[PDB]
Design a protein around this nucleic acid. Structure first.
Lengths: 108, 121, 155, 61, 158, 74
RNA sequence: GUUUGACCUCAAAUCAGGUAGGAGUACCCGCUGAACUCAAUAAGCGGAGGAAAAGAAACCAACCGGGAUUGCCUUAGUAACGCGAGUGAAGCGGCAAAAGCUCAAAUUUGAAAUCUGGUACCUCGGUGCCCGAGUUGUAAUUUGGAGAGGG
RNA sequence: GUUCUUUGUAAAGUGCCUUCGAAGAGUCGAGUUGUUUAUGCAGCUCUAAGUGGGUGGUUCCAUCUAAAGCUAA
RNA sequence: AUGGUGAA
């Protein structure tokens, strides 16, 4: 019989791991940029939701490269395509804003 | 077995919270270990998560803006020889089998010769 | 009983023509590791103190030999009979015949490799040569490819 | 059981090669993979850890 | 390459040439012991596409198993038992008989420095991969386990 | 998908050479013999049982006709 | 030239460099598997690590597409079955974490450019030399997101 | 931060013009016999295709490229 | 029932 006695302990451990990753990954926000996505199953299509990573077409339209996007911590989804212009435009605008806001230090 | 063992102390509970931000000395200067990760990020004026956080809730950046080849000896001698032989006539250098052993194209020839001249006038 | 596609080997080139082929191949033995290393050291010493015609050598590696084949770059193909995986060489004579390239079979893979430094070579081929190659090709044809053109028969 | 094979395909000869792969420059260039080793030997000689071939003969005492 | 032709040749197993080869090799395999080392793989294309290489440290085995548990997994376990220090990365069919089936198995030595010194195969030296065939983690083992893709008590504090 | 698997002539030549060198398997031998001694319908019916999918048997039976026709010409 | 060496195979070592047995077994991975539908439960067998396993789709999807694997809530005590005792999920939705990828696959052929072992120096290895493995394929370049040659 | 080295006609990326341009077989599949919570696996005869094949529901459409492998959270 | 124990 499983009992979740460690719920508080598990939360504390997760917070400690997040803080440790923040110390290791201080300059970056720990996570990677992800696109806006529309769910299937019309019961949920009306509601937008996050996604895994941007398509190669979105990255190309954003003005950068897949490898450069990965090094800039941008999620990439090679197996995902674009079928609606609204979502593509939203992703392009999000990528443009992120590129404008980010500042990259030299490799030195 | 524990009975036999009772019949290697290690302290780490306190050391598991005071994590040093070794990833960036610049951040460490303005970092505050007394505050949370999100609180520290807000104090430093840097985003903590690119996605919407779950549930309820710029001098530092100014100090981050400041942070933001030649030919080989044998290659240099070969390029000098080609320049002496033909000067700027890349078309003639292309057919110069004596020196253009690799059959360099008209573009690579000029691309290398311009850099050669940069250090030779 | 062996199928007609098999037993094409074992019936191989005659003694005199085989010896002539071996002698011709010996004239273009690839540079060995020691010779290549010493030549490179000499070139480095000359350059380090104070532009050659394209070399020629026999082709032996199965993969690149077959790569030259089909492209019609193989002037002559020599195949060993005692190769353990027969399937490696069953299709090679057929490919050579289809592409219209002279081919021959020999007995002893080790003897085939002895002329190319390696312990064994399975098959060998030549890309460039001086003028005895045409005579050797004609002899091989008239002695194996045309005299034993009925290899598709028998069992 | 005992019948001959048919050379239906091994009777005509192809003209054009099966593939039209572009010709690489390396085939027309003096073995750059070998110039790499030549320059490695040059570097080793410069470092002095490799003795020139002449000194090998000159030191056969 | 020759592999492009070898694969197609092996595809038509019912062809006369392969039928003769199998019946020729069956007797030689039978005369050999139940488990014996193979100097070279009789199906180089299959082994090469299975990730096997001719470099030092790679070993090809052959083993006979009675016909009539999955035969491939049983053969892999049997070869691993005798070859305690080797890892059974994969195995493949080579010949079948009325009473016995023959499966070739490729072994990789983790102790050999050559295998440990290359990044393409050093992963196999980890202790986690020890006795891979025993747990059915190989291709045959995974298939037998039914690891397909698709359809094919707890009490909280509150 | 953006790739279907075009033969590109190279695979055509390789497979034709393999078919020629390897000859015909007993199934193919029987198929061609029944084509020359029975008919296309009989060949298709035999293939449907010898082989698995009906479409695969139909394609092979259709290909055998061309194999016989071109092979017997030369 | 009846002499010979190669290649292939079969044996031996108080030879040099290496490894498996056994124990523990809560968790994990497979085989086998009993009785008050009980239960793919218990025992038995074999193998491993700090986690194990799985893991980057021949997946779910019928949508205005999602997009590695695994855990929680929900889907849901619903679909479904035995409609009868009892069994019993999965997509979507929210949460914690996210990472990519490598070979077969097309000529390095103007240079097997690859690597194991022995030896002399400075030593989780590097250099020269020698042997051996390698052509029945060792390095770089290509893994479907395609990719290569060139200007 | 500090340094001794930086290199050899060495390596990579990106847009433009052009030419080339592969895919894991006794395997998918099929029939049967045992197991399985009417999916899968196993023994066995057959066992194939590459503008091909696998899964689904509507007059043939949507997605993917299997029969090799590594990978912390 | 499982896994062991011993005997004339």
């Amino acid at each position: 019989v499983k009992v979740h006695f460690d719920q508080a302990g598990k939360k504390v451990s997760r917070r400690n791991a997040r803080a440790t990753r923040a110390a290791k990954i201080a300059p970056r926000p720990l996570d990677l940029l992800r696109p806006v996505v529309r769910a299937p199953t019309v019961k949920y299509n009306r509601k937008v939701r996050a996604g895994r990573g941007f398509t190669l077409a979105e990255v190309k339209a954003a003005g950068l490269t897949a490898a450069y996007a990965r090094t800039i911590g941008i999620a990439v989804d090679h197996r995902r395509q674009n079928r609606n212009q609204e979502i593509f435009d939203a992703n392009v605008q999000r990528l443009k804003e992120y590129q404008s806001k980010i500042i990259v230090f030299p490799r030195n | 077995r524990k009975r036999k063992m009772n019949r290697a102390t290690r302290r780490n509970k306190d050391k598991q919270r005071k994590i040093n931000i070794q990833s960036n000395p610049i951040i460490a200067a303005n970092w505050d270990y007394s505050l949370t990760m999100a609180q520290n990020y807000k104090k430093l004026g840097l985003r903590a998560k690119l996605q919407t956080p779950a549930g309820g809730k710029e001098t530092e950046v100014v100090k981050k803006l400041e942070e933001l080849r030649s030919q080989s000896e044998r290659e240099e001698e070969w390029l000098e020889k080609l320049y002496k032989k033909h000067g700027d006539d890349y078309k003639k250098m292309f057919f110069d089998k004596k020196l253009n052993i690799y059959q360099q194209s008209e573009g690579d020839l000029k691309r290398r010769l311009l850099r050669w001249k940069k250090r030779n006038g | 009983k062996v199928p007609p596609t098999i037993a094409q080997f074992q019936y191989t080139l005659d003694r005199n023509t085989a010896a002539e082929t071996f002698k011709l191949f010996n004239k273009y033995r690839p540079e060995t590791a020691a010779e290549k290393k010493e030549r490179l050291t000499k070139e480095a010493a000359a350059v380090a103190e104070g532009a050659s015609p394209k070399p020629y050598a026999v082709k032996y590696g199965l993969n690149h030999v077959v790569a030259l084949i089909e492209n019609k770059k193989a002037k002559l193909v020599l195949i060993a009979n005692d190769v353990d995986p027969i399937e490696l060489v069953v299709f090679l004579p057929a490919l050579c015949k289809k592409m219209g390239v002279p081919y021959a079979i020999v007995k002893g893979k080790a003897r085939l490799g002895t002329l190319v430094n390696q312990k064994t070579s399975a098959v060998a081929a030549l890309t460039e040569v001086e003028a005895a190659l045409a005579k050797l090709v004609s002899t091989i044809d008239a002695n194996f490819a045309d005299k034993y053109d009925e290899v598709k028969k028998h069992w | 059981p005992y019948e001959p094979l048919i050379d239906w395909f091994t009777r005509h000869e192809e003209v054009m090669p099966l593939t039209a792969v572009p010709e690489p420059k390396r085939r027309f260039v003096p073995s750059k993979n070998e110039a790499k080793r030549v320059m490695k030997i040059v570097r080793a000689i410069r470092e002095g850890r490799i003795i020139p071939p002449k000194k090998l003969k000159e030191m056969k005492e | 390459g020759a592999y492009k032709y070898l694969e197609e040749l092996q595809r038509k197993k019912q062809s006369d040439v392969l039928r003769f080869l199998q019946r020729v090799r069956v007797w030689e395999y039978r005369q050999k012991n139940v488990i014996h080392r193979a100097a070279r793989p009789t199906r180089p294309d299959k082994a090469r596409r299975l990730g096997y290489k001719a470099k030092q440290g790679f070993v090809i085995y052959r083993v006979r198993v009675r016909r009539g548990r999955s035969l491939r997994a049983t053969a892999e376990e049997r070869v691993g038992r005798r070859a305690a220090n080797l890892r059974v990365l994969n195995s493949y069919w080579v010949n079948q008989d009325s009473t016995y089936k023959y499966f070739e198995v490729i072994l990789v030595d983790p102790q050999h420095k050559a295998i440990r010194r290359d990044a393409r195969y050093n992963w196999i030296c980890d202790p986690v991969h020890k006795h891979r065939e025993a747990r059915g983690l190989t291709a045959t083992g995974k298939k037998s386990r039914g690891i397909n893709k698709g359809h094919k008590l707890s009490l909280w504090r509150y | 998908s953006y790739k279907k698997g075009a033969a590109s002539n190279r695979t055509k030549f390789v497979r034709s050479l393999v078919r020629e060198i390897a000859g015909l398997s007993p199934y193919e031998r029987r198929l061609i013999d029944l084509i020359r001694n029975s008919g296309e319908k009989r060949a298709r019916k035999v293939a449907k049982k010898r082989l698995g999918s009906f479409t695969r048997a139909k394609a092979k039976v259709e290909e055998m006709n061309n194999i016989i026709a071109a092979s017997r010409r030369h």
